[model samples]
Target: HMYNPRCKDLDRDYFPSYHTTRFQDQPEPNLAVLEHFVRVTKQHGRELTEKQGITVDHLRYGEGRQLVDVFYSEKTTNQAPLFVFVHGGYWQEMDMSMSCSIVGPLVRRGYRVAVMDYNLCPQVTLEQLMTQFTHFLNWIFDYTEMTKVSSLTFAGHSAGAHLLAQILMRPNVITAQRSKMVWALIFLCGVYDLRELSNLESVNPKNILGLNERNIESVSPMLWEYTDVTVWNSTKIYVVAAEHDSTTFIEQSRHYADVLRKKGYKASFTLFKGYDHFDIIEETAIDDSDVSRFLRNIEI
Candidate 1:
């Protein structure tokens, strides 16, 4: 049977509500706004590319769409920290070009921002995407220009957050010395428990990603044993959920923060009021929005 043994053929479909398809409190709960979010986000990306006083570098770290778009102020200092962002598309959609909503603001503040792009699922397995991220980690750490970078702050939304958590568990992909350079981690509206995804119906991620009991245990960060608290305990982690996000999405952030706290990590959970999944990220483009203020608070 292709389905997991625990999955009955009944097709309980509550998982779609847990994922983002429509805005949380506009018009009606059933109204579709994903198209609207995408359009605006891409518009921000375009503005970022043409923005003055910013330098954009397109670098490829692997074969077939494994790219990283680095943005920095023209006056970027040697001591500027690197803020690496991985966009969320349920591990199968979106790219670096369309994920530049926060790049301009961060670059203006003298922070070097790197927006990463990876191969989406259905074309590449989730495991393969992990390997590519591993390559990305090594490449960024080993890049000659990075030697001058002061520190690294990583932020990922949705599936991107899950991927970052998975990388943390591996430990070997990044060197012990390089691991210490990680300053902070921001996870936005993410799912940490892969097992729960087996119930998703809107996009049917479990089927599309070929998730199963055997692999789910390996990839799910919630299931990992946090016995080693070396660099992780020193690093700061922020688990952010939105006010309009689904119950499951918010619960995941709160629960994951507790788990990290139990492991001695300096983790904090924040629920952004009046924001939904898409707007939570899109708001970063605004000058004085709550999301931008939160990003500004990230210390070097």
Candidate 2:
């Protein structure tokens, strides 16, 4: 169903209050999914040795002490475009290693993939995390010239996707030269609106974004006006929404794509059939899956 931007109040419709009733009412998983994710990752970490033979580099970005994990196929040619992957854990949990699994598919497609980590919330404001990522991108752009590499593409899932959108909305935050290096963006099941989380007092994210009206709107890329930006015309944006995702998120992605198109930007929205928020990333590993097709479609 197409969204009615005029009729729907995203601020009221997207916040957590409107949907937590359903979250709380649903049958709880036998194990907390987050907990299970950590446990399973830890168990799998032992058997996986450096023998898989991908080059993993550890680097720090920004004076604020943000760490990033960069993975690349060992073949040293300055020709391949870089793919940056961001992981989502509500901006409070998860790290680069937790998302290393994504590197394989990207590398298999003959691209270098970098997974970045930022300071989680409570310890750092959402604004700070956004700034950290911006700085990280700048640092990479600077480092690559010395290291002799060119070009970058961003592909992020969930919260990671939100970070990419934020970066795109404010390309001035990055250096002018580096901004030009970004060829395209791939957002997978990303959150575009934080105002949607405002009402859910029980699962309130307001503590992280502050409850003030301006702050909430400022941090939300969905609410930000991209037409005011110079990069709006140059960059290509591809939004992949999970068909079975929460209605609020679905609306957020759809609306953002609509706005981008209306502003004369190159934007496309695709719904991966029969997939939910989590399954979107999971299916990317499958060779012939819809997720794989989405990734291939954006290849530069």
Candidate 3:
């Protein structure tokens, strides 16, 4: 068993729990809850896109299903900050449409919100997915060039956070000038070090990531050196874990936050109370929700 060292028992039984979401104290089936979240998000997405005085751009950032849905008020100017969200489904399930839980609220708050989608796994290797996401970042930088976007805040959940972490630590993902514009990064319920999943058959039942002992080393962000030092020192990074999240996930978030702080980045770890893995993200749609309030505090 490729056990997560953080797990005290080093138990193979608990290894699958690290990579999967099982809500705590929830009566309904996990799949049903997930479906409900998706439906509500899509409903909000439709309403937001259809509203007047809002510009919604469906952009093709890369070939073969790499796309982003950008939303901004028609009254928005170059001074508005940009908020980009990347959704997660263990690199297999979910898409941008189902990830729009917070789009309307953010746009209403006067920030431009962009929700991105990439091709899922098994159909594409992790290597390809990473490259595709880098392309997406390049597209974002180029798109904001003329407008001189005031600041850029990236928020990701689970696997999405992993991708963002990988990109932020890589040297050439963004230019020095562009990197300085990155004001904040928010990672929610993320799995930072992916090495343990390499040998766990249950986590990658279909060999979704195609990871192994050798190749996993190259992909794990927890083991990475912070290569993109050009990112402004003032940039804030929040590594958030839900209170009811798996122990491994909470540890991962705390460890990743420590790693960032040691590297001289302003990173903090937070355990959001009263939320499990799924609702930590799903509740972002509610204005009074804890997650929503936290996001609003990140000023433009």
Candidate 4:
């Protein structure tokens, strides 16, 4: 892999084109994406009106920081499964509301889903974000009755996937008792290794994610040693890659899966042919889409 010199230079206004501009500065689509999400939720809000044995709870009241919003849907079935869904925004933007659209569908399948929001960077370090997510998972395990659920499944897109993978490899974040509750992991186009992106400096967001070799490797889930944790041995990992994604994303997913398989973990990698990064998540709304089928098949 070739490292772009511009990738190492953080001050060079790296984003020039409209398509490749920084997320915050990008006009039109950035805000429009949020607006579109709001409109869609408003239209579908009535469908989720039924409160059948489900409860929505907000956790982590921010003290001078952005509060992490967590919505919990309690399963009506006594032995229902638990699913946690994390939204993706390259570790800088987006929140739990973006995944609100999937709440109805998930609940319809008899599973309780928890959508979470985490503190964005520039206000909090990436390490802090990872710790906060760990705390959130631990809280769920502590508060929820273990016998009530058959298993725990973690599902995340982009950066959220990276966080979930790290959690799987770090059982200390969740107590031994809680760690046993975790059954499977679903990673949707998450960045597993920073080195893949680091090599391509021009397109990588190394500046946002500090460039020190040690720090990069530390933050990259794909480079971490899963064998160090006992919980990892029993976890099943499902990695989904988009064919139209950047080289960095594809390489990281493939590399992580190969490593996991070598370690004897039940791991599988699937490529969404003809799909791009955004379209992968967008198609989760369509019942007949590959994304939907993948999710349902795994749930089975």
lDDT of 2 by residue, 1-300 (tens): 123344455444432223222233336532343444556444332222254456767778854437766666677454666788778766777765566656666766777777777788767777777777777767767666665566777878777888877665555656556666777878887777676465555335557544456677767777776645465456678887777665766777888788778777789887768776665665554557777776786665
TM-score of each: 0.87, 0.81, 0.88, 0.76
Q: Candidate 4, which segments miss by more than 4 Å at Cα?
A: 1-55, 61-75, 175-177, 196-211, 228-230
lDDT of 4 by residue, 195-243 (tens): 5555444544455554456677678776666665555556778888787
Report how far residue 277 has shifted in candidate 4, in Å.
1.3
- Candidate 3 per-residue C-alpha lDDT over 1-300 given as tens digits, one digit per residue, 9 for 90 to 100: 222355554343333233334543555555565666678777766777675356788888977668888888887674688899988888888887788887777877888888899987877888678878888888887777757775889999988998888656545757667777888899998877877665555668767787766777667888887755536575788999888766777788899999888887888999988777777777777778888999988764
Clashing pairs in 2: 14-196, 15-196, 15-197, 16-197, 17-200
lDDT of each: 0.76, 0.66, 0.76, 0.63
118, model 3: CA deviation in Å? 0.4
* Model 3's TM-score against the true structure: 0.88
RMSD to native for every prediction?
4.3, 4.7, 3.2, 5.5
Over 35-129, each residue of candidate 1 has an lDDT whose tens digit, in order, gives: 66678888888888675567788998998789988887767775688888888888777887678898887887778888889988867777677
Question: Model 4 has how many clashing residue pairs?
Answer: 2
Clashes of 3: 0
Number of the predicted model whose lDDT against the real structure is largest: 3
> What residue pairs clash in candidate 4, if any at all?
3-199, 7-201
**Comparison by TM-score, 1 against 2, better one:** 1
